Amino acid sequence: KVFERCELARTLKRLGMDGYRGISLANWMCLAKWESGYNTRATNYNAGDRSTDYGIFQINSRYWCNDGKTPGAVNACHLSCSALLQDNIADAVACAKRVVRDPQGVRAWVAWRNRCQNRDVRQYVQGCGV
Numbered sequence: 076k077v078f079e080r081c082e083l084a085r086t087l088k089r090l091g092m093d094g095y096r097g098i099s100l101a102n103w104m105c106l107a108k109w110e111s112g113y114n115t116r117a118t119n120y121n122a123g124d125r126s127t128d129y130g131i132f133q134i135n136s137r138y139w140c141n142d143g144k145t146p147g148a149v150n151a152c153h154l155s156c157s158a159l160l161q162d163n164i165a166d167a168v169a170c171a172k173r174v175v176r177d178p179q180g181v182r183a184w185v186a187w188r189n190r191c192q193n194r195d196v197r198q199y200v201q202g203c204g205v
């Protein structure tokens with residue numbers, strides 16, 4: 076499903092993402108925006124290394140979820156990548172929390188560095204009542 080901005084903002088706060096491992100809600104919104112356009116069904120095949128990015132946070136199959144076709148991959152979130160394509164984002168959120176528990180933190184996603192880091196991200200949560 077494609078979330079509306081504020082709808083997603085409120086959902087993420089209820090799922091405990093605000094300030095998770097030091098990452099503000101506005102940063103998570105900036106990330107979801109640039110990764111999928113707030114679309115839970117988005118997938119991106121990376122022909123270069125044969126891995127696929129899944130869902131709203133575009134989580135990669137090489138380390139986080141299992142899709143069976145990615146060479147030498149692990150499944151740290153202990154989830155089928157299918158779980159990351161549901162309309163209910165609970166599993167995607169639990170996995171995203173797992174990703175940021177690693178040393179890189181939110182820097183794990185290159186898109187965050189390009190379009191969110193050191194920018195004014197307040198705009199993503201403005202007027203949503205969170």
Ligand code: NA
Binds near residue numbers: 135142149
């Ligand atoms: Na995997």
